[PDB]
Structure 1
Amino acid sequence: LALSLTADQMVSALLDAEPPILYSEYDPTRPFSEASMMGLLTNLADRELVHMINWAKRVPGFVDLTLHDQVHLLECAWLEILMIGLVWRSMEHPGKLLFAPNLLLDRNQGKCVEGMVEIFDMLLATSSRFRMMNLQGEEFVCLKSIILLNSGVYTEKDHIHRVLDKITDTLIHLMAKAGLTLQQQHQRLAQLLLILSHIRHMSNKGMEHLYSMKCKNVVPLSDLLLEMLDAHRLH
């Protein structure tokens, strides 16, 4: 299946498999706290995780994987995917992070939670980068799919890399239609995949922060989100 899709069929499948944009609880009457803001982020994440599971299975090649392999890839990349989505939604809102259509936070609001500003600035910086590169939607769904398959591939695998190569062919196909030269095609491809390194960095930082908020007992985490957090085992 996955190995037989054209570049256009690959794009169509990924675009169709896109998860919806959920809303935050967030009563604007309620003043912000460290527990309140962390509560909004974890409540949103827990509801987003469910859709991420159904998104992943509709990503070409992912259904062909072992159930244990599926669990592994999602456990290591769930925050990466959550963050690259956050960065993508916030792309047209400079200086602001669109966690939800009704939850729009800037740098200063991130200071309500300790150690959050550093993560906010990184997320904002990545969003500016996407804006500077004029990241297309077709490219976003590819990068997000790449993260899902690549983040835990080293921690069967022949098939995974075969799909990863397929998505690469897709990204190249997209850029060629955009009118880019062979040099411009490889260049942009490199620029996009190097962003995933930063996304990885923000994830590992976000993990330690989330684990920090867990031990500080400022916010009750859902049992699913708790399992996602224990999958990394930090401190």
Structure 2
Amino acid sequence: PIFLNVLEAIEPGVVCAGHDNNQPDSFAALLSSLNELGERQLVHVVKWAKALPGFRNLHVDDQMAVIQYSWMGLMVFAMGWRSFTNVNSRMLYFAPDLVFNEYRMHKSRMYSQCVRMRHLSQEFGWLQITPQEFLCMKALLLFSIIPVDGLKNQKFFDELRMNYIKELDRIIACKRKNPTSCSRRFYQLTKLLDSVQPIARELHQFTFDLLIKSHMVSVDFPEMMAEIISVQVPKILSGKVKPIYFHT
């Protein structure tokens, strides 16, 4: 109960975008709001991550890198859950003041990615994902993308990741488990976790392209964002840093 206790305890609260729901759904205004929300979420993900059990075990530089690389996916996963819980996956609940309907999914020019995120969101329902399974999975997501040539202290990372996999196994396996149930459950969740990496890559590519042409579409990028997108995101896109997949 100690592990789960801290996961619930450190879970971020409601984060609003500050979007003007009175202005028209322009690509510019929507994306400017997603960016600002992205920044706000980054702030919370950093304080959240740093308060995770064993996170301080990681070397100093590995700490921020692991957060910056996995940030997009962490936002994807949590947002999918928010969508499931609040609107039954009908729309994408980015924030209480920024809910995407089909019109907004289209106006943002991110329809394809939105569509995939809505699918992931639906998976929480189909799979009957537990609020506890969700928390553990989100935590594991933090340690799911690293430089192909390793970190400053890979050994500490590997141990940290190993322990979080075990916690998941512990949660998704405390009841009479065996056959199509114990491993059935684990396979389902690991497959679900892998499914977030392709969404994050698509989002990374899209965000990168948008930053590059930002002054041409009147889309505003916050400081921390422009930096992460221009410094860490290209490493993922060029293959230097890659997701850790369970399958295939």
TM-score calculated relative to the size of structure 1: 0.89
* Counterpart for residue 79 of structure 1: 72
Separation in structure 2 between the aligned mates of residue 24 and residue 75 of structure 1, nearest angstrom: 20
Separation in structure 1 between the aligned mates of residue 177 and residue 40 of structure 2, nearest angstrom: 42
* Residues 159-168 or 29-38, more deviating: 159-168
Separation in structure 1 between the aligned mates of residue 105 and residue 176 of structure 2, nearest angstrom: 38
Q: Deviations over 1:127-154 (max 9, x none)?
A: 1111101111111111111111121164
Say which of 142, 160, 165 aligns to 1:163: 160
For structure 1, the residue ranges without an aligned partner over 5 or more in a row are 1-7
Separation in structure 1 between the aligned mates of residue 156 and residue 45 of structure 2, nearest angstrom: 21
* Counterpart for residue 123 of structure 1: 117
* Counterpart for residue 3 of structure 1: none
TM-fit CA distance, 1:180 = 4.9
- Answer whether contact 1:172 1:186 (CA < 8 A) is retained: no
* Counterpart for residue 241 of structure 2: none
Moved >4 Å (runs of 4+)? none
User: What is the one-letter code of the residue matched to 1:232?
Assistant: V
Separation in structure 2 between the aligned mates of residue 197 and residue 171 of structure 1, nearest angstrom: 14
Matched, 1:143 2:144: no
TM-fit CA distance, 1:80 = 0.5
* Counterpart for residue 8 of structure 2: 15
TM-fit CA distance, 1:188 = 1.2
Separation in structure 2 between the aligned mates of residue 109 and residue 79 of structure 1, nearest angstrom: 20
TM-fit CA distance, 1:165 = 2.6
User: What is the one-letter code of the residue matched to 2:192?
Assistant: I
User: What is the one-letter code of the residue matched to 1:42?
Assistant: N
Map 1:193-204 onto structure 2 (within 5 A): 193-204=190-201
Secondary structure class of the residue paired with 2:44: helix
Separation in structure 1 between the aligned mates of residue 162 and residue 64 of structure 2, nearest angstrom: 22
Matched, 1:46 2:43: no
Matched, 1:152 2:153: no
For structure 2, the residue ranges without an aligned partner over 5 or more in a row are 239-248
User: What is the one-letter code of the residue matched to 2:107?
Assistant: C
TM-fit CA distance, 1:84 = 0.5
Q: Deviations over 1:27-70 (max 9, x none)?
A: 22111111111011111110111111110111112112111101
- Answer whether contact 1:73 1:153 (CA < 8 A) is retained: no
Separation in structure 2 between the aligned mates of residue 223 and residue 180 of structure 1, nearest angstrom: 50
Secondary structure class of the residue paired with 1:182: coil
Matched, 1:101 2:96: yes
- Answer whether contact 1:73 1:149 (CA < 8 A) is retained: yes
Separation in structure 2 between the aligned mates of residue 207 and residue 153 of structure 1, nearest angstrom: 16
RMSD: 1.7
TM-score calculated relative to the size of structure 2: 0.85
Separation in structure 1 between the aligned mates of residue 100 and residue 79 of structure 2, nearest angstrom: 11
- Answer whether contact 2:208 2:233 (CA < 8 A) is retained: no
- Between the aligned residues of both structures, percent identity stands at 22
TM-fit CA distance, 1:162 = 2.4
TM-fit CA distance, 1:196 = 2.1
Separation in structure 2 between the aligned mates of residue 29 and residue 72 of structure 1, nearest angstrom: 38
